[PDB]
């Protein structure tokens, strides 16, 4: 019955396809979503084709198709089809996200973050275009880049720009790009993805991880705080990079890891210890409080714990009064998980040189 309806997704007639997807989008959330996997995931492939169609891919059809893909993207076998069956779709997806006229950019960011669970997403690191004007690439009509906003020709650089500059609808009335945080979080799990965030990029000469740090304190957007916290943690996977990253003053990593676990009230720290805190941790507002979400805090402690792997790192953290900060977190926040991590950090800061 639904089997009959999905087949019309590859009808030759646009108006039939339109009626088909309009009636199917509702059935893509529940148990009934098995129908989209018929005939070796033919309906998925059809929907992907409808979305990319320059002529018949209207605003509504794109919104419906992407909504379907988002729902089905929970299944890993579907994510395979979306990424590997047709390589154009990923190119289509990332470039339509940076098109600041696209009203479906946000819901597409969600799809992108879901696809980032599979290592096939690493293809985004190589996606580039030849010029910033309206261009044809492998049969795709790429819209022209906003040259004022986007100085790069690489997609990863443009997605970064959208995230960093596009919060609170500063670039588009349609999107804030919050879920690109989860995209960065998931892609940074992979080695090649981690290498993007901790290495200086040519197009603007900065290490990308530094551009994310400011959102650690954005308390009206927990998705951005969650994603950024994980991205920092993943970026610190290799301990041989820690000395470089901690001591690079134009990155300035540590203060933005510590601010979320710092509080103005309830925290008792000596004048002597307070003098050794980073500048940003000094003279805090009186209403300054810790991140209320424990999972985010734990993620930050995991990062601090990673930075305790190396003697040079531990020396740096001890010199910046990380121990008093972790002590007062342990005292004032009764949560078992946070507590465990606090004493794990102290265990590491306790040991000397090997």
PDB file of C-alpha atoms in Angstrom, residues 94-305:
ATOM      1  CA  UNK A  94      27.482  21.758   2.026  1.00  0.00           C
ATOM      2  CA  UNK A  95      27.306  24.452  -0.676  1.00  0.00           C
ATOM      3  CA  UNK A  96      23.549  24.954  -0.242  1.00  0.00           C
ATOM      4  CA  UNK A  97      24.222  25.443   3.481  1.00  0.00           C
ATOM      5  CA  UNK A  98      26.606  28.343   2.823  1.00  0.00           C
ATOM      6  CA  UNK A  99      24.144  29.878   0.352  1.00  0.00           C
ATOM      7  CA  UNK A 100      22.717  32.601   2.578  1.00  0.00           C
ATOM      8  CA  UNK A 101      19.478  32.766   0.573  1.00  0.00           C
ATOM      9  CA  UNK A 102      18.600  29.147   1.368  1.00  0.00           C
ATOM     10  CA  UNK A 103      15.594  28.917   3.721  1.00  0.00           C
ATOM     11  CA  UNK A 104      16.324  25.242   4.446  1.00  0.00           C
ATOM     12  CA  UNK A 105      19.911  25.721   5.628  1.00  0.00           C
ATOM     13  CA  UNK A 106      19.242  24.830   9.288  1.00  0.00           C
ATOM     14  CA  UNK A 107      17.381  21.573   8.675  1.00  0.00           C
ATOM     15  CA  UNK A 108      20.223  20.718   6.282  1.00  0.00           C
ATOM     16  CA  UNK A 109      22.803  21.380   8.987  1.00  0.00           C
ATOM     17  CA  UNK A 110      20.994  18.761  11.056  1.00  0.00           C
ATOM     18  CA  UNK A 111      21.243  16.227   8.228  1.00  0.00           C
ATOM     19  CA  UNK A 112      24.924  17.082   7.834  1.00  0.00           C
ATOM     20  CA  UNK A 113      25.586  16.486  11.546  1.00  0.00           C
ATOM     21  CA  UNK A 114      23.869  13.095  11.338  1.00  0.00           C
ATOM     22  CA  UNK A 115      25.974  12.034   8.349  1.00  0.00           C
ATOM     23  CA  UNK A 116      29.101  12.941  10.324  1.00  0.00           C
ATOM     24  CA  UNK A 117      28.702   9.718  12.313  1.00  0.00           C
ATOM     25  CA  UNK A 118      30.251   7.830   9.375  1.00  0.00           C
ATOM     26  CA  UNK A 119      33.869   8.325   8.290  1.00  0.00           C
ATOM     27  CA  UNK A 120      32.634   8.844   4.737  1.00  0.00           C
ATOM     28  CA  UNK A 121      31.933  12.406   5.863  1.00  0.00           C
ATOM     29  CA  UNK A 122      35.686  13.042   5.670  1.00  0.00           C
ATOM     30  CA  UNK A 123      35.140  13.796   1.978  1.00  0.00           C
ATOM     31  CA  UNK A 124      34.051  17.297   3.047  1.00  0.00           C
ATOM     32  CA  UNK A 125      37.680  18.117   3.883  1.00  0.00           C
ATOM     33  CA  UNK A 126      38.510  17.866   0.150  1.00  0.00           C
ATOM     34  CA  UNK A 127      35.416  19.543  -1.292  1.00  0.00           C
ATOM     35  CA  UNK A 128      36.467  22.772  -2.988  1.00  0.00           C
ATOM     36  CA  UNK A 129      35.308  24.900  -5.923  1.00  0.00           C
ATOM     37  CA  UNK A 130      37.375  26.686  -8.576  1.00  0.00           C
ATOM     38  CA  UNK A 131      35.822  30.162  -8.310  1.00  0.00           C
ATOM     39  CA  UNK A 132      33.509  32.083  -5.976  1.00  0.00           C
ATOM     40  CA  UNK A 133      31.021  32.892  -8.755  1.00  0.00           C
ATOM     41  CA  UNK A 134      28.071  30.888 -10.090  1.00  0.00           C
ATOM     42  CA  UNK A 135      29.696  27.709 -11.354  1.00  0.00           C
ATOM     43  CA  UNK A 136      28.924  24.270 -12.756  1.00  0.00           C
ATOM     44  CA  UNK A 137      30.566  21.367 -10.915  1.00  0.00           C
ATOM     45  CA  UNK A 138      29.894  17.780 -11.992  1.00  0.00           C
ATOM     46  CA  UNK A 139      26.444  18.743 -13.271  1.00  0.00           C
ATOM     47  CA  UNK A 140      25.541  20.905 -10.265  1.00  0.00           C
ATOM     48  CA  UNK A 141      24.605  24.581 -10.432  1.00  0.00           C
ATOM     49  CA  UNK A 142      26.544  25.925  -7.447  1.00  0.00           C
ATOM     50  CA  UNK A 143      25.228  29.365  -6.488  1.00  0.00           C
ATOM     51  CA  UNK A 144      27.712  32.234  -6.217  1.00  0.00           C
ATOM     52  CA  UNK A 145      29.482  32.703  -2.889  1.00  0.00           C
ATOM     53  CA  UNK A 146      29.066  35.891  -0.899  1.00  0.00           C
ATOM     54  CA  UNK A 147      32.602  37.182  -1.474  1.00  0.00           C
ATOM     55  CA  UNK A 148      32.280  39.650   1.418  1.00  0.00           C
ATOM     56  CA  UNK A 149      31.674  36.825   3.907  1.00  0.00           C
ATOM     57  CA  UNK A 150      33.527  33.842   2.424  1.00  0.00           C
ATOM     58  CA  UNK A 151      37.223  34.306   1.590  1.00  0.00           C
ATOM     59  CA  UNK A 152      37.843  30.580   1.013  1.00  0.00           C
ATOM     60  CA  UNK A 153      37.049  28.183  -1.824  1.00  0.00           C
ATOM     61  CA  UNK A 154      37.096  25.159   0.504  1.00  0.00           C
ATOM     62  CA  UNK A 155      33.779  23.984   1.945  1.00  0.00           C
ATOM     63  CA  UNK A 156      35.122  23.226   5.430  1.00  0.00           C
ATOM     64  CA  UNK A 157      36.355  26.812   5.689  1.00  0.00           C
ATOM     65  CA  UNK A 158      32.960  28.130   4.584  1.00  0.00           C
ATOM     66  CA  UNK A 159      31.052  25.952   7.030  1.00  0.00           C
ATOM     67  CA  UNK A 160      33.318  27.284   9.780  1.00  0.00           C
ATOM     68  CA  UNK A 161      32.521  30.851   8.711  1.00  0.00           C
ATOM     69  CA  UNK A 162      28.784  30.132   8.772  1.00  0.00           C
ATOM     70  CA  UNK A 163      29.061  28.769  12.296  1.00  0.00           C
ATOM     71  CA  UNK A 164      31.371  31.459  13.668  1.00  0.00           C
ATOM     72  CA  UNK A 165      29.695  34.488  12.049  1.00  0.00           C
ATOM     73  CA  UNK A 166      26.149  33.207  11.557  1.00  0.00           C
ATOM     74  CA  UNK A 167      24.997  32.768  15.153  1.00  0.00           C
ATOM     75  CA  UNK A 168      21.851  34.587  16.296  1.00  0.00           C
ATOM     76  CA  UNK A 169      20.873  34.979  12.632  1.00  0.00           C
ATOM     77  CA  UNK A 170      23.698  37.429  11.860  1.00  0.00           C
ATOM     78  CA  UNK A 171      24.162  36.129   8.288  1.00  0.00           C
ATOM     79  CA  UNK A 172      20.660  34.858   7.487  1.00  0.00           C
ATOM     80  CA  UNK A 173      17.103  35.334   8.743  1.00  0.00           C
ATOM     81  CA  UNK A 174      16.534  31.616   8.129  1.00  0.00           C
ATOM     82  CA  UNK A 175      19.383  30.004  10.064  1.00  0.00           C
ATOM     83  CA  UNK A 176      21.772  30.242  13.020  1.00  0.00           C
ATOM     84  CA  UNK A 177      23.750  27.122  12.041  1.00  0.00           C
ATOM     85  CA  UNK A 178      23.729  25.758  15.608  1.00  0.00           C
ATOM     86  CA  UNK A 179      23.882  22.088  14.612  1.00  0.00           C
ATOM     87  CA  UNK A 180      27.146  22.538  12.722  1.00  0.00           C
ATOM     88  CA  UNK A 181      28.541  22.242  16.236  1.00  0.00           C
ATOM     89  CA  UNK A 182      27.545  18.565  16.263  1.00  0.00           C
ATOM     90  CA  UNK A 183      29.031  18.275  12.783  1.00  0.00           C
ATOM     91  CA  UNK A 184      32.387  19.583  14.056  1.00  0.00           C
ATOM     92  CA  UNK A 185      32.095  17.366  17.124  1.00  0.00           C
ATOM     93  CA  UNK A 186      31.584  14.190  15.098  1.00  0.00           C
ATOM     94  CA  UNK A 187      34.103  14.883  12.326  1.00  0.00           C
ATOM     95  CA  UNK A 188      36.820  15.752  14.859  1.00  0.00           C
ATOM     96  CA  UNK A 189      36.626  12.179  16.190  1.00  0.00           C
ATOM     97  CA  UNK A 190      38.524  11.089  13.073  1.00  0.00           C
ATOM     98  CA  UNK A 191      42.262  11.705  12.735  1.00  0.00           C
ATOM     99  CA  UNK A 192      42.036  13.719   9.502  1.00  0.00           C
ATOM    100  CA  UNK A 193      39.179  15.723  11.015  1.00  0.00           C
ATOM    101  CA  UNK A 194      41.123  16.497  14.185  1.00  0.00           C
ATOM    102  CA  UNK A 195      44.020  17.698  12.045  1.00  0.00           C
ATOM    103  CA  UNK A 196      41.812  20.359  10.485  1.00  0.00           C
ATOM    104  CA  UNK A 197      40.992  21.997  13.796  1.00  0.00           C
ATOM    105  CA  UNK A 198      44.519  22.149  15.274  1.00  0.00           C
ATOM    106  CA  UNK A 199      46.406  23.260  12.140  1.00  0.00           C
ATOM    107  CA  UNK A 200      46.618  26.769  10.702  1.00  0.00           C
ATOM    108  CA  UNK A 201      44.534  27.135   7.533  1.00  0.00           C
ATOM    109  CA  UNK A 202      45.652  29.297   4.606  1.00  0.00           C
ATOM    110  CA  UNK A 203      42.471  31.255   3.863  1.00  0.00           C
ATOM    111  CA  UNK A 204      42.624  33.328   7.078  1.00  0.00           C
ATOM    112  CA  UNK A 205      45.809  32.123   8.768  1.00  0.00           C
ATOM    113  CA  UNK A 206      44.280  30.971  12.067  1.00  0.00           C
ATOM    114  CA  UNK A 207      43.916  27.627  13.832  1.00  0.00           C
ATOM    115  CA  UNK A 208      40.182  26.816  13.520  1.00  0.00           C
ATOM    116  CA  UNK A 209      39.702  25.547  17.094  1.00  0.00           C
ATOM    117  CA  UNK A 210      40.401  29.057  18.415  1.00  0.00           C
ATOM    118  CA  UNK A 211      37.359  30.399  16.559  1.00  0.00           C
ATOM    119  CA  UNK A 212      35.047  28.014  18.443  1.00  0.00           C
ATOM    120  CA  UNK A 213      36.261  28.707  21.976  1.00  0.00           C
ATOM    121  CA  UNK A 214      34.129  31.821  22.451  1.00  0.00           C
ATOM    122  CA  UNK A 215      30.915  29.771  22.273  1.00  0.00           C
ATOM    123  CA  UNK A 216      31.833  27.798  25.376  1.00  0.00           C
ATOM    124  CA  UNK A 217      30.053  30.567  27.328  1.00  0.00           C
ATOM    125  CA  UNK A 218      27.001  30.990  25.069  1.00  0.00           C
ATOM    126  CA  UNK A 219      24.262  30.186  27.574  1.00  0.00           C
ATOM    127  CA  UNK A 220      21.285  30.717  25.264  1.00  0.00           C
ATOM    128  CA  UNK A 221      22.522  27.972  22.904  1.00  0.00           C
ATOM    129  CA  UNK A 222      23.230  24.614  24.548  1.00  0.00           C
ATOM    130  CA  UNK A 223      23.664  22.814  21.215  1.00  0.00           C
ATOM    131  CA  UNK A 224      26.647  25.036  20.422  1.00  0.00           C
ATOM    132  CA  UNK A 225      28.095  24.547  23.921  1.00  0.00           C
ATOM    133  CA  UNK A 226      27.665  20.766  23.689  1.00  0.00           C
ATOM    134  CA  UNK A 227      29.212  20.458  20.233  1.00  0.00           C
ATOM    135  CA  UNK A 228      32.094  22.839  20.907  1.00  0.00           C
ATOM    136  CA  UNK A 229      32.968  21.083  24.166  1.00  0.00           C
ATOM    137  CA  UNK A 230      33.327  17.768  22.346  1.00  0.00           C
ATOM    138  CA  UNK A 231      35.285  19.339  19.493  1.00  0.00           C
ATOM    139  CA  UNK A 232      37.850  20.735  21.933  1.00  0.00           C
ATOM    140  CA  UNK A 233      38.110  17.355  23.669  1.00  0.00           C
ATOM    141  CA  UNK A 234      38.543  15.466  20.390  1.00  0.00           C
ATOM    142  CA  UNK A 235      41.139  17.973  19.191  1.00  0.00           C
ATOM    143  CA  UNK A 236      43.329  17.135  22.200  1.00  0.00           C
ATOM    144  CA  UNK A 237      43.527  13.412  21.401  1.00  0.00           C
ATOM    145  CA  UNK A 238      47.273  13.414  20.636  1.00  0.00           C
ATOM    146  CA  UNK A 239      49.331  14.380  23.693  1.00  0.00           C
ATOM    147  CA  UNK A 240      52.306  15.424  21.568  1.00  0.00           C
ATOM    148  CA  UNK A 241      50.272  18.435  20.384  1.00  0.00           C
ATOM    149  CA  UNK A 242      49.428  19.749  23.858  1.00  0.00           C
ATOM    150  CA  UNK A 243      52.534  21.856  24.521  1.00  0.00           C
ATOM    151  CA  UNK A 244      52.142  23.661  21.198  1.00  0.00           C
ATOM    152  CA  UNK A 245      48.417  24.260  21.713  1.00  0.00           C
ATOM    153  CA  UNK A 246      48.650  25.397  25.336  1.00  0.00           C
ATOM    154  CA  UNK A 247      51.471  27.869  24.690  1.00  0.00           C
ATOM    155  CA  UNK A 248      50.146  29.384  21.459  1.00  0.00           C
ATOM    156  CA  UNK A 249      48.838  32.721  22.743  1.00  0.00           C
ATOM    157  CA  UNK A 250      46.741  33.507  19.649  1.00  0.00           C
ATOM    158  CA  UNK A 251      44.811  30.287  20.250  1.00  0.00           C
ATOM    159  CA  UNK A 252      44.508  30.888  24.004  1.00  0.00           C
ATOM    160  CA  UNK A 253      42.914  27.527  24.771  1.00  0.00           C
ATOM    161  CA  UNK A 254      42.878  27.015  28.542  1.00  0.00           C
ATOM    162  CA  UNK A 255      40.764  29.981  29.730  1.00  0.00           C
ATOM    163  CA  UNK A 256      37.775  28.874  27.640  1.00  0.00           C
ATOM    164  CA  UNK A 257      38.006  25.354  29.057  1.00  0.00           C
ATOM    165  CA  UNK A 258      38.027  26.750  32.603  1.00  0.00           C
ATOM    166  CA  UNK A 259      35.405  29.523  32.435  1.00  0.00           C
ATOM    167  CA  UNK A 260      32.473  27.078  32.348  1.00  0.00           C
ATOM    168  CA  UNK A 261      33.675  25.420  35.589  1.00  0.00           C
ATOM    169  CA  UNK A 262      34.347  28.738  37.353  1.00  0.00           C
ATOM    170  CA  UNK A 263      31.957  30.630  39.633  1.00  0.00           C
ATOM    171  CA  UNK A 264      31.946  34.037  41.303  1.00  0.00           C
ATOM    172  CA  UNK A 265      29.899  32.880  44.295  1.00  0.00           C
ATOM    173  CA  UNK A 266      30.544  29.963  46.697  1.00  0.00           C
ATOM    174  CA  UNK A 267      34.124  29.518  45.418  1.00  0.00           C
ATOM    175  CA  UNK A 268      36.896  30.004  47.992  1.00  0.00           C
ATOM    176  CA  UNK A 269      40.291  30.632  46.371  1.00  0.00           C
ATOM    177  CA  UNK A 270      43.353  32.254  47.956  1.00  0.00           C
ATOM    178  CA  UNK A 271      44.634  35.635  46.756  1.00  0.00           C
ATOM    179  CA  UNK A 272      47.878  33.880  45.842  1.00  0.00           C
ATOM    180  CA  UNK A 273      46.201  31.230  43.696  1.00  0.00           C
ATOM    181  CA  UNK A 274      43.869  33.809  42.148  1.00  0.00           C
ATOM    182  CA  UNK A 275      46.839  35.838  40.917  1.00  0.00           C
ATOM    183  CA  UNK A 276      47.987  32.819  38.891  1.00  0.00           C
ATOM    184  CA  UNK A 277      44.622  32.324  37.160  1.00  0.00           C
ATOM    185  CA  UNK A 278      44.415  33.341  33.484  1.00  0.00           C
ATOM    186  CA  UNK A 279      43.432  36.992  32.921  1.00  0.00           C
ATOM    187  CA  UNK A 280      39.951  35.983  31.778  1.00  0.00           C
ATOM    188  CA  UNK A 281      39.325  34.166  35.076  1.00  0.00           C
ATOM    189  CA  UNK A 282      40.134  37.309  37.087  1.00  0.00           C
ATOM    190  CA  UNK A 283      37.650  39.922  38.306  1.00  0.00           C
ATOM    191  CA  UNK A 284      34.635  37.852  37.287  1.00  0.00           C
ATOM    192  CA  UNK A 285      31.148  39.399  37.279  1.00  0.00           C
ATOM    193  CA  UNK A 286      29.267  38.824  40.531  1.00  0.00           C
ATOM    194  CA  UNK A 287      26.560  36.835  38.728  1.00  0.00           C
ATOM    195  CA  UNK A 288      29.099  34.597  36.949  1.00  0.00           C
ATOM    196  CA  UNK A 289      28.024  30.963  37.344  1.00  0.00           C
ATOM    197  CA  UNK A 290      29.025  27.509  36.110  1.00  0.00           C
ATOM    198  CA  UNK A 291      27.509  25.754  33.096  1.00  0.00           C
ATOM    199  CA  UNK A 292      24.397  24.075  34.550  1.00  0.00           C
ATOM    200  CA  UNK A 293      24.581  21.031  32.237  1.00  0.00           C
ATOM    201  CA  UNK A 294      26.743  18.342  33.917  1.00  0.00           C
ATOM    202  CA  UNK A 295      27.550  16.493  30.675  1.00  0.00           C
ATOM    203  CA  UNK A 296      29.121  19.631  29.231  1.00  0.00           C
ATOM    204  CA  UNK A 297      31.139  20.211  32.414  1.00  0.00           C
ATOM    205  CA  UNK A 298      32.295  16.592  32.395  1.00  0.00           C
ATOM    206  CA  UNK A 299      33.385  17.025  28.792  1.00  0.00           C
ATOM    207  CA  UNK A 300      35.509  20.001  29.848  1.00  0.00           C
ATOM    208  CA  UNK A 301      37.064  18.027  32.701  1.00  0.00           C
ATOM    209  CA  UNK A 302      37.870  15.245  30.239  1.00  0.00           C
ATOM    210  CA  UNK A 303      39.761  17.873  28.218  1.00  0.00           C
ATOM    211  CA  UNK A 304      41.668  19.084  31.282  1.00  0.00           C
ATOM    212  CA  UNK A 305      42.393  15.446  32.080  1.00  0.00           C
TER     213      UNK A 305
END
